[PDB]
């Protein structure tokens, strides 16, 4: 099990910056999207590295409906339901040629991933995250077994706020990772 860690995905990377004092009141004002998170279900972020959904068979839509693409369609009885809200969420700059970095503790291998990112005019701290504001940037083969898989993603014309939405097919079973990460597209190397 695991997630996307560069660029963070959403409740990662709440976990990763709160976890040590996920109670304070003052969340509210310096990170209101993690705050409602941490507030809705805790274990959204406690288990930050089971946002998966067995069974999907590739066709990725039909079990992930319009709106919650980042709580996986309600996988685990909505555990993940808040990471779907729609505010602004901490991004991690990147430039339009990057890497997705994923951990995976287990090394359970990837068959595929496939990597989509908002349309240019979307903007995710005011519209609910639907396909149709996605574009396929990057699409694997297969990953043999490891604890870190990096995917190298191209992009040309693309600024400000996005999210990416990464999707990791899992080789030891049907296994799908659905993990979106907020970026803000930019010139500037970090």
């Given at each position: 099990?695991?997630?996307?860690?560069?660029?963070?995905?959403?409740?990662?990377?709440?976990?990763?910056?709160?976890?040590?004092?996920?109670?304070?009141?003052?969340?509210?004002?310096e990170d209101p999207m993690c705050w409602?998170?941490?507030?809705?279900?805790?274990?959204?972020?406690?288990?930050?590295?089971?946002?998966?959904?067995?069974?999907?068979?590739?066709?990725?839509?039909?079990?992930v409906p319009d709106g919650q693409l980042?709580?996986?369609?309600?996988?685990?009885?909505?555990?993940?339901?808040?990471?779907?809200?729609?505010?602004?969420?901490?991004?991690?700059?990147?430039?339009?040629?990057?890497?997705?970095?994923?951990?995976?503790?287990?090394?359970?291998?990837?068959?595929?991933?496939?990597?989509?990112?908002?349309?240019?005019?979307?903007?995710?701290?005011?519209?609910?995250?639907?396909?149709?504001?996605?574009?396929?940037?990057?699409?694997?083969?297969?990953?043999?077994?490891?604890?870190?898989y990096e995917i190298p993603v191209t992009?040309?014309?693309?600024?400000?706020?996005?999210?990416?939405?990464?999707?990791?097919?899992?080789?030891?079973?049907?296994?799908?990772?659905?993990?979106?990460?907020?970026?803000?597209?930019?010139?500037?190397?970090?």
């Open positions: 099990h695991g997630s996307v860690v560069d660029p963070a995905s959403r409740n990662y990377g709440c976990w990763l910056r709160w976890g040590d004092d996920f109670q304070n009141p003052a969340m509210e004002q409602q998170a941490w507030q809705a279900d805790p274990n959204a972020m406690w288990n930050w590295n089971g946002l998966y959904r067995n069974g999907s068979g590739g066709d990725f839509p039909a079990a980042c709580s996986g369609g309600r996988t685990e009885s909505g555990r993940y339901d808040s990471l779907d809200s729609v505010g602004a969420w901490k991004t991690t700059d990147i430039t339009d040629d990057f890497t997705v970095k994923l951990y995976d503790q287990a090394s359970h291998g990837a068959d595929y991933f496939q990597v989509y990112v908002t349309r240019q005019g979307f903007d995710p701290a005011a519209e609910a995250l639907t396909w149709s504001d996605l574009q396929l940037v990057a699409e694997t083969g297969r990953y043999a077994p490891s604890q870190n992009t040309s014309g693309l600024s400000g706020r996005h999210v990416v939405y990464t999707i990791w097919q899992a080789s030891h079973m049907d296994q799908t990772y659905f993990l979106c990460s907020d970026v803000n597209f930019t010139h500037h190397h970090h």
